[PDB]
């Protein structure tokens, strides 16, 4: 045989998203931002737990974290920065043979299409998640260095070819191929209406002391950076189970549905990576999947 996974091996996050700060504006003037704050209102009435005969009567004070767009401004502003980091084949942890042979094996990877679908996940608006719903007008601007480019909608899953997304993807692929960094600034504008429901990222609620303790930075509503990166890493259509891009993953799995798209049918990262380095030559789409999950990072050794 040949080289197994090392005692320690991991790669670092190469798509670094800033945590989103959400503002409220208008489509008339898109710069008079306000603060979409997260307050608390008391919710009582949720009862009837399992094995409750007489104790299903108390009024639990559950000051849940409500999140609504203000009535004054009828356009949400999701503002965040996206930072592409190069040197996506150098492993910080473990970096050795397995990793170098990986870098020489993944030399013919089409960085252009990875960059294209990376910028597409911003231009389509998958990063809004439940905020893109309820909007007929979506505005996406990419404030990369001294050039702002506007994007309407490109459809979260429908993957056509666009010109300006590709011309951003040129220097994005130039950063991701070798070294260096590029930082592109993102603003997202939607009519949701007055008193509409804005949906930021949730958080850990275990006990029945609250219901939602959503991620807000300094009291202002926020998307988690991991969720924004999850929207970024929705790359895989080389998943041989279907055609609704999954968020790349060593097993292609979501916990939201509970199924695993790439766990077992020779599309694991571990088996195909061992095949990639150990000597088995492979195709372009799954090699690009290895490359994209190497922009994801994670642990790759045991």
Partner 1 sequence: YNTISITVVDADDVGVNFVVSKVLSTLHNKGIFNGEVGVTFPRMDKNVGDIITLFSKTGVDRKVLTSTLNTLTDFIHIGKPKEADKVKTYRKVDTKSKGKLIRRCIKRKGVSAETAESLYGNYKGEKCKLPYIVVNSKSTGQRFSMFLEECENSEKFNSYGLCIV
Nearer to partner 1, 144 or 246 (CB): 246
Closest separation in Å from C-beta 214 to partner 1 = 15
Q: Which of 7, 28, 45, 72 binds partner 1 (CB under 8 A)?
A: 45
Closest separation in Å from C-beta 254 to partner 1 = 7
186 contacts: CB under 8 Å, gap ≥ 6: 78, 79, 80, 81, 82, 122, 127, 140, 141, 142, 143
Residue 46 lies near partner 1 (rule: CB under 8 A): yes
Closest separation in Å from C-beta 256 to partner 1 = 8
- Residue 17 per-residue DSSP state: E
3-state SS class at 256: coil
E strand intervals along the chain: 10-11, 15-17, 20-25, 39-43, 62-66, 75-85, 138-144, 147-151, 181-191, 216-217, 220-223, 234-236, 246-247, 298-299
Residue 145 lies near partner 1 (rule: CB under 8 A): no
Candidates 26-34, 110-118, 177-185, 246-254: pick the segment binding partner 1 (CB under 8 A): 246-254
Residue 72 lies near partner 1 (rule: CB under 8 A): no
Q: What share of the chain is helix, strand, coil (3-state, %, to 5)?
A: 25, 25, 50
Given a contact cutoff of 8 angstroms between Cβ atoms, the answer to whether 248 and 292 are in contact is: yes
Residue 210 lies near partner 1 (rule: CB under 8 A): no
Residue 136 lies near partner 1 (rule: CB under 8 A): yes
Closest separation in Å from C-beta 8 to partner 1 = 33
From 287, 292, 201, 208, select the one nearest 245 (Cα to Cα): 292
Residue 52 lies near partner 1 (rule: CB under 8 A): yes
Given a contact cutoff of 8 angstroms between Cβ atoms, the answer to whether 65 and 213 are in contact is: yes
Q: How far apart are CA 283 and CA 138, in angstroms?
A: 37
Q: Looking only at residues 101 through 130 of this chain, which bind partner 1 when binding is defined by CB under 8 A?
A: 126, 129-130
Residue 214 lies near partner 1 (rule: CB under 8 A): no
Closest separation in Å from C-beta 65 to partner 1 = 13
Closest separation in Å from C-beta 120 to partner 1 = 14
Candidates 47-55, 95-103, 159-167, 210-218: pick the segment binding partner 1 (CB under 8 A): 47-55
Residues 80-99: x where in contact with partner 1 by CB under 8 A, - otherwise, as a string: --------------------
Residue 135 lies near partner 1 (rule: CB under 8 A): yes
Residue positions counted in the chain: 302
Q: Which of 117, 132, 188, 233 binds partner 1 (CB under 8 A)?
A: 132
State both tokens at 188: 């997202």
Q: Which of 57, 107, 146, 161 binds partner 1 (CB under 8 A)?
A: 57
Assign residue 266 a region (left: φ > 0; alpha: ψ between -120 and 50; beta: otherwise): left
Burial class from Cβ neighbours inside 10 Å (0-12, 13-18, 19+) for residue 281 reads: exposed
Given a contact cutoff of 8 angstroms between Cβ atoms, the answer to whether 239 and 246 are in contact is: yes
Candidates 11-19, 21-29, 160-168, 245-253: pick the segment binding partner 1 (CB under 8 A): 245-253
Which residue ranges make up the site for partner 1 (CB under 8 A)?
Answer: 44-48, 52, 54, 56-57, 59, 126, 129-130, 132-136, 153, 155-157, 195, 197, 231, 234, 244-247, 254, 256-257
């Amino acid at each position: 045989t040949k080289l197994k996974a090392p005692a320690v091996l991991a790669y670092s996050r190469k798509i670094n998203p800033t945590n989103a700060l959400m503002f409220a504006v208008n489509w008339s003037d898109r710069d008079n931002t306000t603060a979409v704050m997260v307050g608390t209102k008391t919710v009582a009435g949720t009862q009837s737990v399992r094995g409750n005969p007489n104790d299903a009567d108390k009024g639990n004070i559950q000051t849940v974290n409500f999140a609504n767009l203000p009535h004054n401004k009828n356009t949400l502003l999701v503002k965040y920065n996206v930072k592409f980091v190069g040197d996506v084949f150098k492993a910080e942890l473990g970096g050795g043979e397995y990793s170098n042979t990986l870098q020489t094996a993944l030399e013919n990877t089409d960085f252009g299409t990875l960059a294209y679908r990376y910028v597409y996940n911003i231009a389509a608006g998958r990063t809004l998640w439940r905020n893109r719903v309820g909007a007929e007008s979506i505005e996406t601007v990419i404030t990369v260095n001294d050039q702002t480019f506007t994007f309407s909608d490109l459809l979260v899953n429908e993957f056509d070819e666009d010109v300006d997304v590709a011309e951003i993807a040129d220097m994005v692929a130039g950063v991701l191929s070798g070294e260096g960094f590029v930082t592109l600034k993102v603003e997202h504008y939607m009519l949701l209406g007055e008193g509409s429901e804005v949906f930021p990222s949730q958080e850990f609620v275990e006990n029945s002391k609250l219901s939602k303790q959503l991620f807000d930075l300094n009291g202002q509503a926020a998307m988690h950076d991991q969720k924004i990166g999850n929207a970024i890493r929705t790359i895989d259509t080389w998943y041989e189970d279907a055609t609704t891009p999954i968020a790349v993953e060593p097993y292609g799995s979501v916990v939201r549905n509970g199924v695993a798209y790439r766990a077992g049918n020779k599309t694991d990262l571990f088996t195909l990576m061992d095949g990639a380095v150990n000597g088995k030559s492979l195709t372009e789409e799954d090699q690009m999947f290895v490359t994209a999950n190497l922009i994801r990072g994670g642990v790759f050794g045991g």
